[PDB]
Copies of this chain bind each other. A is one copy, B any other.
Amino acid sequence: PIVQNLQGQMVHQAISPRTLNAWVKVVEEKAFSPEVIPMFSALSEGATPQDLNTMLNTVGGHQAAMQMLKETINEEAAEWDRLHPVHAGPIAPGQMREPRGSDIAGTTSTLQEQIGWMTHNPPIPVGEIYKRWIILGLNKIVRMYSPTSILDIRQGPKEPFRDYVDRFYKTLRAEQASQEVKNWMTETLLVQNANPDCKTILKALGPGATLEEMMTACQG
Q: Give A91 to B38 CA distance when docked, in angstroms.
A: 32
Contact with B along A190-220 (1 / 0, CB 8 A): 0010000000000111100011110111000
Query: Chain B contacts of A172 at CB under 8 A?
Result: 63
Of B3, B7, B20, the contact of A14 (CB 8 Å cutoff):
B3
Give the contact stretch, choosing among A53-61, A77-85, A92-100.
A53-61
With both beta carbons as reference points, the residue of chain B lying nearest to A216 in the complex is identified as B144
Cβ-closest chain B residue relative to A63: B169
Q: Which of B38, B144, B206, B211 contacts A215 (CB 8 A)?
A: B144
**Interface residue A8 (Cβ < 8 Å from any Cβ of B):** yes
Residue of B nearest to A22 (CB): B17
Q: Could you say which interface size class chain A belongs to? A: 35 or more
CB-CB under 8 A for A54 and B38, given A8-B7, A63-B166: yes
Query: Copy number of this protein in the oligomer?
Result: 5
Q: Which of B6, B54, B71, B204 contacts A5 (CB 8 A)?
A: B6
CB distance from A165 to the nearest CB of B (A): 5
Question: In the complex the two chains form, is A38's CB within 8 Å of B58's CB?
Answer: yes
Is A88's beta carbon under 8 Å from chain B?
no
Closest to A209 in B: B206
A173 contact set on B, CB distance < 8 A: 63
Give the complex CA separation of A144 and B210 in angstroms. Answer: 14
Is there an interface contact between A178 and B184, defined as CB atoms closer than 8 Å? Answer: yes
Q: How far is the CA of A45 from the CA of B161 in the complex (A)?
A: 36
* 9 interchain residue pairs of minimum CB distance: A7-B8, A63-B169, A38-B57, A5-B6, A14-B45, A35-B60, A17-B22, A42-B54, A181-B184
Question: Which residues of A are in contact with B by a Cβ distance under 8 Å?
Answer: 1, 3-9, 11-15, 17-23, 26, 30, 33, 35, 38-39, 41-43, 45-46, 54, 57-64, 66-68, 71, 140, 144, 151, 162, 165-166, 169-170, 172-173, 177-178, 180-181, 184, 186, 188, 192, 203-206, 210-213, 215-217
